[model samples]
Target: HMTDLKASSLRALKLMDLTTLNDDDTDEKVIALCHQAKTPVGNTAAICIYPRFIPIARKTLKEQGTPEIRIATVTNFPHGNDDIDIALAETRAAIAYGADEVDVVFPYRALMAGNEQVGFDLVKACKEACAAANVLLKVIIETGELKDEALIRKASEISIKAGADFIKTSTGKVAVNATPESARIMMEVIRDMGVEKTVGFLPAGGVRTAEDAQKYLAIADELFGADWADARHYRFGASSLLASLLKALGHG
Candidate 1:
């Protein structure tokens, strides 16, 4: 299952290593690693990596016979301050570079400063640029920075209206990240807008355990139902939570 992880917590390096590439020295090493990871369970939902690395990831993972892995890349990542045109161009280039899904950061500063239309316009332009690739666009709202419940609701509504496939909570760069209350609020807003199916929710960042994952999962189950618990409707944008959940499930 570690093979499916797009990000790894390297204890020796004391940092989280995120990638889509296997990074083995040679084809023989790659094949050996794949054989060791050939469990009955399927691969991860997607492999998140840097945009420039998508082609190499595609080539490496495909050569290892893991063709089902979805290639996910970031746009306006960690920060949402990029110029709208530049952001759109980045999205276009990521898709052109073979990313199956593009996760872009929303303009939180503008949105929180009462200029939601600016953020909305940016997302819309990105959606248009991503149309040809038919790539799924997940808008990272950076809810922690918004610092207000009403703004979160408004941001969620704007993202859905602007054609985001999913509304994500954080970039893992903030002091505060996803919370059940925030998730509930966002989900309720999406439901009320009648775009539940079109716009899903992802509560990411600072999630470190099964209980954390379950808290967000329970929120979705309570509000969106068990049917919506699948990846299409909900996802935990976490690098550590899955392993903790597996340990809780006695599979670790």
Candidate 2:
């Protein structure tokens, strides 16, 4: 069991989206977070922060000379509104500010209210913005709000069809975040899309420990094979998950 924990903990380290999307975040905090991306074990897949912190994260990572660690920022965040212009502009600005990835919130409220077309258009708009800048688009479906299994599957389908490079499960601002059932539904949608498309999966929020991270990795491993859940195709959007992973790895 300890051997399993160590292996999954190492995998989790490589596939983590080391995040700090707090309102009180400062330049110092962002810099610290960027530095934290380079653990003794290895670097995380990316560092996700607020749009305003993208420049600081960029500067810090450049100084540290670790360009492989991507910079991901949010757009139309947490709220998941249908303001296409706002989402588009936010995504463009984040890209211009040196963000390598844009995690835009899917219009889950609209979908919950039965305004499916608006949700589709918003994600499409964000995807268009990201494509023009060659930035990866990660559409956060906020699955915690869309508790229904059908809605979760539908949101995942919409994100993949709209050209999201990654379909994230939450914004980490909701009451319930990143459940395995929701993650399974999201991955199932991706699996059914066939090999032509290469949409990835990320489970944000509440993923606090190495075991929690392993649980998601096990789901991905089962669905996509052991080799499929690498940094390119799988990510855990977590702010405080690294320490526990390190603990499991005997580095904490």
Candidate 3:
């Protein structure tokens, strides 16, 4: 029904990480992105952009009266390289620049080479930095690269153990971004681990249509509960998704 479509679209909008991580993104582009936060029902959960644009995003969002829309940036990014120094510095810099959340790509390259400690150390160090500033640390496990179910679960377990506030599925720069199977594996780890600690979930990339976005929402709702997947704990990272959501809500 129209009612359910509108309701789901609004919910997704509220939980969205309205993102723009393109190669040619500029200050003017980011400013425009910030201005797009508000909609017919409510604002997006956050604006996910490069660290270089955080300050601009901050200023624009404040000017737009939507400062509550958090500012999130990435560290260790789409490559998932095992460079602790770079990733750690990126995290600290992003936090210092007023970033509300930091998404660090798990060092999947090292993990694929059977070096779990690399990914572990990077997440642990980044988490420490984020915790000091009260900023959230989201570990992007890049499940597409991890591929195997065991590897996906392992990455989730490692991230949770190392203090990931949330475990994200991908960086949206991969051949395959977020998938239902990968999301289910990640959610399973979250469910079992939440017995002792709570960790959020984000499925980024390829989440364009509201219908595709709902599958991830339904997974969370099924694994936990309807109330479990709120903006604080659940997010969809997509640039085009905002348009689809707005269209569903009968807005531009």
Candidate 4:
């Protein structure tokens, strides 16, 4: 059971790593490191980096011959407090830089404060910007800080309605991050709204081991089904979890 759990967890941890790429390392170096990680049982689904690093990511992945390793960037990341126009511009800029996937954060405080239209419009405009670039959009609702299940559900619904390909849980920047209970509730609402086919789920922040990875995967399997267990339908936005899972699986 432990070995099986370790394998399952390692697979879940390999979906993606939304790590910020710094100047200390080149994109090629980052891709090389990801390729070196023995967890996940295969190549990484994607490597999330800053918008400025998308070209670097593309080049690195291409040179490394890592097929299907998507180049993902974040817009209005960590904090989704930018004005709608600015946020949209940021999204367009990221896409212009060659990001295949873009994750944008929703204004949690604004939504909870009853500015539903503002929050919805913010994501809507970001989606429009992404549409022009033909990049997939993942809107991070930051469920950890919302403090209200209903609002979290509303945010999830609004993001899907506004054209998000995936509804993410957190940015790994808040006090309270993604949790199974919150994920279950948000996914339930998403399914009830009839957008399950187009919308997906990502749980980020505080995930640090094979055990943690499996817990989220279990939640996804229960809520979204075994078919949704793949990288496209489900993703774990964790940094340390991959290595931890690899170690647990005796890969390192």
Candidate 5:
């Protein structure tokens, strides 16, 4: 009587971007996060945290013998500032500290303020910096604030055009975060691109359950088929969701 929840939750294990973005995050805290990523059931795809802790995460993942869980960090994060130089420097420094993926919050406020180019330039500069360092760049569009499907699609387009390796829905910092409509709109942007579907999709922020996580994966299936819905092309940004996944798998 397992309720068929095991596999549903386990599917996200490899694609899960376990996160700890709290202000109180410490070296030991990140070390513990790394330890948990190497759970008994499965390992997570990565651990995302503040840039200053990347070295600790990098070293800890290696020491913990779960080096496959790539180190990820956030920049221009939560605020979505339009400051290009600062964002650029932050992205590079994270990569230098050994981040496999960099989730950058694009200045959605700038787009709302009719400065689309500002957001585009900021994302592009961060993209260039990440590319030079050979790290994956996830441009968070903060779709929750966009308030409409068209804006979500537009932001997705701009991110794609700016060389984003992924287009994320939000920072999960606001009253609202990733929504099904926003996910659908972003997936449509990916589908209509007429390209290799090289850019991935990450429905981060606000996702907190196996059911919640499946909605995003299911959306990918409807748009790009099963080929694009797996971890290689799709991901989730979560912290608490992992606990539910573990319990569902009967490991917690």
Candidate 6:
């Protein structure tokens, strides 16, 4: 039992995009977040932060001996209503600030309101901005509000088609985030799309336990096979999940 937990913790730790996106987040908090990457078991794949704190995170992580860790930032976050101009500007700013990955909120507002074209145009536009900045692009479909397997699957494909390096489950701002049903459908979409295209999956919100992390990772393994789950192909976008993962890995 402990071994399974340890293994899962290790896996999730490697895949984590250890995050902190709060409005009240301070410079002191940014340092603590970067220090998180220095935990004993291993390093997380990246640290997701608000763009303004990018320089702080970058410097702190390097000073802490985790320079290899990527820096990811969000754009059009919490709400996807920003116009193409603003979202593109935000993505460019994040990249310019040293972000290795840019996670943008897709126009779920349009998709939910029955305007798929709106979402499509936003993703295409953001993809170009992220590409030009030379950062990986992750599109948050806000799956929790999507409300059905069919819609989730459709959104996933739409994201992939629009050039999302990963179709993220949520922005973690909503009441519900990262459920098994949504994850299954998203992983299936990524699987069927074929790994050759390199579209990835990220189940972010509320993933606070090692067991829960394992369950999500297991789905990726089932749909994509052994060794198919890796930083390039999958990620966990949570902040609190790291403490539990470290505890399970015996670092607590």
Looking at model 5, which ten-residue stretch has the lowest summed lDDT? 1-10
Writing each residue's lDDT as its tens digit, candidate 5 over 11-54 gives 78778889999988899998899998998877998888898998
| Tens-place lDDT digits, model 6, residues 1-252 | 558778878988999999999989998998998888777777899999999999989889889888999999999988988388888889888888889999999888677777777777788888997888778999999988887787888888888888899889999999999998899988888877874358888999999989999999888777778587789888999978988888787777
lDDT of 3 by residue, 12-118 (tens): 89999999999999999999988888775789999999999999889889888887999999998879889899999989999988899999999997888999998
Q: Candidate 4 lDDT, tens digit per residue, 1-252? A: 557687675567568663654447666666655455323366667777778777766766677677577777788877888488878888889988988889999987888888888778988898887887788899998888886889888988888888888888998888998898888877887689877687878888888877777887787777767777676677777665667766776766
At residue 189, what lDDT does model 5 achieve?
A: 90
lDDT of 2 by residue, 161-238 (tens): 888899999999999999999999899999888742478899999999998998999999898888998777889999
Task: Give the residue spans of candidate 3 off by over 4 A.
Answer: 195-197
For TM-score, candidate 4 versus 6, the one ahead is 6
Q: lDDT of all predictions, in order shown?
A: 0.70, 0.90, 0.89, 0.77, 0.84, 0.87
- For candidate 1, write residues 138-161 as lDDT tens digits: 898888889799888888888888
C-alpha RMSD in Å of predicted model 6 compared with the true structure: 1.4
Model 4 lDDT at residue 194: 79
Clashing pairs in 6: none
Clashing pairs in 2: none
State which candidate, 3 or 4, has the greater TM-score.
Answer: 3
RMSD of each: 6.7, 1.3, 1.3, 2.4, 1.5, 1.4
Ten contiguous residues minimizing lDDT sum, candidate 4: 31-40
Ranking by TM-score: 2, 3, 6, 5, 4, 1
Tell me model 2's lDDT, rounded to 2 decimals.
0.90
For each candidate in turn, the TM-score is 0.82, 0.97, 0.97, 0.91, 0.95, 0.96
Please give the range of 10 consecutive residues that has the lowest summed lDDT in model 1.
Answer: 8-17
| Clash-forming residue pairs, model 5 | none
